[PDB]
Each structure stands twice: as C-alpha cells, then as structure tokens.
Amino acid sequence: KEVVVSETPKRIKGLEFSALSAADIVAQSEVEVSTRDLFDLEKDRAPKANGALDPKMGVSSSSLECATCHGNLASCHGHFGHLKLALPVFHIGYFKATIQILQGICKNCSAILLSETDKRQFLHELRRPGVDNLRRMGILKKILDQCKKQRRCLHCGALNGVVKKAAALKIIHDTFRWVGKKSAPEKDIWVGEWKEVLAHNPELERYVKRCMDDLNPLKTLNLFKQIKSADCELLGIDATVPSGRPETYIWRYLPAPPVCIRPSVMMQDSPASNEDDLTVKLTEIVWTSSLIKAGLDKGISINNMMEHWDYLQLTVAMYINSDSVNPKPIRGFCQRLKGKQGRFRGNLSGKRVDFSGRTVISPDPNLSIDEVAVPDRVAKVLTYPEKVTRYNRHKLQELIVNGPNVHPGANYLLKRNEDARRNLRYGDRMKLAKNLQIGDVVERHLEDGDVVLFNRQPSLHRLSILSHYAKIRPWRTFRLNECVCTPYNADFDGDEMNLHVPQTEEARAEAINLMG
C-alpha cells in the first residue's frame, strides 16, 4: 505494501573530478587487508583469511559466492577494500603538483609567499564569470613566479630559496641564495649549528655543500596540515568540500580495488593458479608496511628503517605507474590505460560486436544494387529479435514451428513472463507455437528483406561502410554486385569483408535512410 514507488528517468549532465579524502576511503571500503599471504595452507578450495582475494571483497571465479552483495559472477559488481600505511609517502601522480604548491608557501610558518594587497588583485581575476581552462591555468603561472621571486615571507620573515627534485623521486629545498650579504641570522645559525659535529669524525668536510635539508613525507604532511583555508584559492584548490584540503594529495591510506578488475585467471597449466601481477604488488606493500609498524615499536636501527620507508615509497610508485622502476617490466595501472589499444581505443572507443561474420567475397551481376547475397549457413546463426504484433502474428506462428533446421525458423524465444530465454531445439514446439502471447519476442533467422551493414576492413573514408538489403543463397560466400566494389575498392583476389546486422527497430530503419 500500500505504498507508492515513483522515480523519473535521469541523465548525466557532466563528470566532475576530485581526489577523495583520507577519510572517504574507509567510508566506501568494507574489509581490511592487514595480513600478508594470499593462500592459507588449510588446503581447501577457497583458502583466503583476511588480507587476500577475500570472499567478501569480491569473487574471482565461477564456483564461488560473493559474501557481501550476493551472487556468483554475473551478480557481483565488485567491492572495495582499504589499506593503512605505517607512515605516509608521496603520490606518484600528484608528485608534480605537490612541489608546485610547495614552491609557493613558506618553509617555516607555511604561508603563501605573497603580500596582502597583491594577492587580492590576483584572485580578482578568478571571480569574473568568463574564465576558461585556457586562461584559468594560464594565470596560475603568474601566481607561482611571484612566490618564487620573493625571498622572505611575511609572518616570520624566514628566508626561502628554491625547492626542486633530487636527480629516488625525493625533493630537496635549496635554501641558500646569498649574493654577498652572508650576515643573515639563519646563515649564522647554519654555520653555528653545524660546527658542533666537526669535533667528531671530521672526515665529513667534503660533504658540506652537497648536504641540504630534506622534505620527507612525514614533514610535508605535517607542513600541509597548518596552511590555512583562506588562501587555498590562489594555488589551485577550492574549499567548501570535505576533501578540499591539500592534506589528501599524498598517500596515507590507499584503497584496494575489487577482484573483478584483477581477476585470478586460471591458465590450467597446473593445479596452481597463475595469479596476476597486480595482487602480488599489493601484497609486497602490506608486507613492507607491516614490518615498519612493528619495527619502530619493537626498535630497529634508524639507518635500517629509512630504506624500508624508501622501498615502500618506491613500491607504491610502481603500483600506479611502472615508468618509475628505473631499471619483464610489470604492468601497472597507468601502463594499461594508455598505449596502442590498451584502453580508450580497443575497449571504449572501438569495441567488439556480437552478430557478425567474415567470409570471402565473390562477384554477382545477376542481383540488383542494394542487395547483398548471404550464404545460408550464416543465415541460420545470425538471428534478429522480432516482437509479436497482430499484423505479423499469423506469420510468426508458422515460423516458430519450422524450427532451427529449415531456413525460415527461429533459434530462441522470450515470453513476456519469462526472464532469461528459451531454446527451441529442446522440447516440443507445436505446443509452444499455439500459445504465443501477443506481447513477446521471437528471434527468427535472417531472411531476405533485412537490413545488413557491410564494410571493408581498412576504412579510408565514410563510404567504406554501407548498408544493404539481403538475399539468402545456398553457396558459402558473400556475393555482391560489381558496381558496389568501387567504394570498398575490393578486388576479389582472396580478400574478405564483414557484415553487421542491427537489432533494434529504430536502428533497422536508420541504417537504410542514412547509409543506404
């Protein structure tokens, strides 16, 4: 019940992007992957304890069950897990945009290296209603030099030089720009603070000018954490969202993807599973980040753990983008979204289509233009959905009783009540023929009158793909007329072309009147 349900159909007006927080990861996650090894030695069929291909993280085979949503392999949409790092590291994607917003702030009190009446002129060029991405990113080139051409801040006056890379993927702050006026307090502290270690082991005198202060991912996180909300608008980010802080641009938590993305493919070269390269990277993260957290608690040497936290910085910057290995190379995330037909060309722009076929061509004068001739062995595989109506009811009762062996018959049937389909080579057909509720859909064979596309495989121009009528002929090749071979520039010397058959009623009508 006695309660209504009602919702309009909706659309998508546009994508809009953001990096999500260090608190929205555990919001959408549901498991945790504390432990390391993927396979318990219980020697069961699905041994996965906590930190593995977990059965309530997803399901990676057809004989299992997803313990969260439910379903075997068609019902599971995939679910996220999360990790928890021991101490933070840098993001290899945002690595450029975590120094270009570190060249702007001070390095002691961490305020933007700008005066007060100057900055108000800058963000006045943001508030006007005509601003494009051509000029929005252009005017941030001027906000950054003006922070780099300004040596000392406002709130403590401490001198700030330049900060750049150190060419693994760590960055250092070149703090000393003296011309001849070396009588600065911080320079006097620098020679005063450093002279105490000259007493012991004075071999370090060839290491003076190369030594320089670091910015490790535990200083910068506790450096970004006190830059105020009021000046975010001048260095790229906006406020008013939760994840609008700059604290969320270096790894402190990282999510784990579902196993639908990274499925455990069974090669069946053995009774062992060929586990893909993406999980064994996600396990070498959780083993390095485990013994660090137990390392600082139990107590291990500081010169020892500083390379473990430098290994884990180098490992998380391989799980994303494997260009930074700096050497059979491991495939990563970024190593498959780009490339020649990795994504975006062979998966999203250009897909693989059902209901197609590819034989050789051979000439035929005796049929008309707009009729391609089709062999009958491919004419009783390529079906076409055909909804029952009172106009075509007396035909479609005569056709379902032919069966899928004589030519004008059907391959399947889907009633309005039924949910999946019904095959027609199994079970009695005449008892199924007589009922045929007027609302349902049969799938007849291809028959002469249908609307069939046709293209050459190297498609030079827009007249390389044309739409034809059909005619069912009893040989084994695609006959077509002589005059139509000029757009396809075919030559009948052994080459082959493929056909497409649309399967709506509004793309069956649009292929003729626009591509006939």
Which amino acid does the sequence have at 447? E
Decide if residue 178 touches other proteins (CB under 8 A): no
Angstrom distances, CA of residue 19 to CA of 170, 218, 227, 250, 393: 22, 20, 19, 10, 57
Decide if residue 509 touches Zn ion (CB under 5 A): no
b/e sequence 273-284, b meaning 16+ C-beta within 10 Å: bebbebbebbbb
Name the nearest CA neighbour of 290 among 501, 460, 36.
36
Q: How far is the CB of 157 from Zn ion (least distance, A)?
A: 7
- Give the Cα separation of 283 and 54 in Å (integer): 13
Q: Which of residues 456-515 bind other proteins (CB under 8 A)?
A: 458-459, 461-462, 464-465, 498, 500, 502-511, 513-515
Q: Which phi and psi (to 5°) does residue 496 adopt? A: -140, 150
Q: Which of 75, 126, 325, 329 binds other proteins (CB under 8 A)?
A: 75
Q: Which of 45, 149, 351, 431 binds other proteins (CB under 8 A)?
A: 351
Name the nearest CA neighbour of 259 among 282, 285, 288.
282
Of Zn ion, other proteins, none, which one does residue 130 interact with (CB within 5 to 8 Å by kind)? none
Q: Which of 64, 73, 87, 109 binds Zn ion (CB under 5 A)?
A: 109
Of Zn ion, other proteins, none, which one does residue 106 interact with (CB within 5 to 8 Å by kind)? Zn ion
CA angle (94, 95, 99) in 5-degree steps: 110
> By CB neighbour count within 10 A (0-12 exposed, 13-18 middle, 19+ buried), where does 310 fall?
middle
Return the sign of the alpha-carbon dihedral for residues 53, 58, 59, 64: positive
Decide if residue 108 touches Zn ion (CB under 5 A): yes
- Are the C-beta atoms of residues 444 and 383 closer than 8 Å to each other? yes
156 is in an annotated binding site: no
Q: How far is the CB of 51 from other proteins (least distance, A)?
A: 17
Q: Which of 123, 156, 204, 507 binds Zn ion (CB under 5 A)?
A: 156
- Give the Cα separation of 313 and 90 in Å (integer): 7
Instruction: Give the max Cα distance, the chain.
Output: 106
Q: Residue 296 is encoded by which pair of tokens?
A: 């600082």
Q: Residue 430 is encoded by which pair of tokens?
A: 């005449």
User: Site for Zn ion (CB under 5 A): how many residues?
Assistant: 9
Q: How many CB atoms lie within 10 A of CB 251?
A: 23
Q: Which of 126, 182, 242, 492 binds other proteins (CB under 8 A)?
A: 242
Decide if residue 40 touches other proteins (CB under 8 A): no
| 255 contacts: CB under 8 Å, gap ≥ 6 | 25, 28, 29, 80, 81, 82, 83
Q: How far is the CB of 402 from other proteins (least distance, A)?
A: 15
Decide if residue 380 touches other proteins (CB under 8 A): yes
Q: Which stretch, 24-32, 102-110, 136-144, 407-415, contacts Zn ion (CB under 5 A)?
A: 102-110
Coil/strand/helix, residue 478: strand
- Per the listing, tokens 């975010």 go with 232
Decide if residue 8 touches other proteins (CB under 8 A): yes
Q: Which phi and psi (to 5°) does residue 462 adopt? A: -75, -10
54 is in an annotated binding site: no
Q: How far is the CB of 223 from other proteins (least distance, A)?
A: 8
Decide if residue 66 touches Zn ion (CB under 5 A): yes
Of Zn ion, other proteins, none, which one does residue 303 interact with (CB within 5 to 8 Å by kind)? other proteins
Of Zn ion, other proteins, none, which one does residue 440 interact with (CB within 5 to 8 Å by kind)? none
Q: Which of residues 263-282 bind other proteins (CB under 8 A)?
A: 265-266, 268
79 is in an annotated binding site: yes
Q: Which of 153, 312, 373, 497 binds Zn ion (CB under 5 A)?
A: 153
User: Site for other proteins (CB under 8 A): how many residues?
Assistant: 199
Q: Which of 34, 142, 280, 344 binds other proteins (CB under 8 A)?
A: 344
Q: How far is the CB of 24 from Zn ion (least distance, A)?
A: 11
Q: How many CB atoms lie within 10 A of CB 141?
A: 9
Decide if residue 125 touches other proteins (CB under 8 A): no
Return the sign of the alpha-carbon dihedral for residues 244, 247, 253, 256: positive
Decide if residue 87 touches other proteins (CB under 8 A): yes
Q: Which stretch, 65-73, 172-180, 207-215, 472-480, contacts Zn ion (CB under 5 A)?
A: 65-73
| 462 contacts: CB under 8 Å, gap ≥ 6 | none
- Give the Cα separation of 92 and 168 in Å (integer): 12
Decide if residue 229 touches other proteins (CB under 8 A): yes
- Give the Cα separation of 282 and 288 in Å (integer): 10
- Give the Cα separation of 333 and 336 in Å (integer): 6
491 is in an annotated binding site: yes
b/e sequence 32-46, b meaning 16+ C-beta within 10 Å: bbeebebbeeeeeeb
Decide if residue 103 touches Zn ion (CB under 5 A): no
Of Zn ion, other proteins, none, which one does residue 493 interact with (CB within 5 to 8 Å by kind)? none
Decide if residue 106 touches Zn ion (CB under 5 A): yes
Q: How far is the CB of 449 from other proteins (least distance, A)?
A: 7
Nearer to other proteins, 34 or 423 (CB): 423
Q: Which of 174, 307, 370, 482 binds other proteins (CB under 8 A)?
A: 307
Residues in binding site: 66, 69, 76, 79, 106, 109, 153, 491, 493, 495
Q: Which residues bind to Zn ion, rule: CB under 5 A?
A: 66, 68-69, 106, 108-109, 153, 156, 158
Residues in binding site for Zn(2+): 66, 69, 76, 79, 106, 109, 153
Residues in binding site for Mg(2+): 491, 493, 495
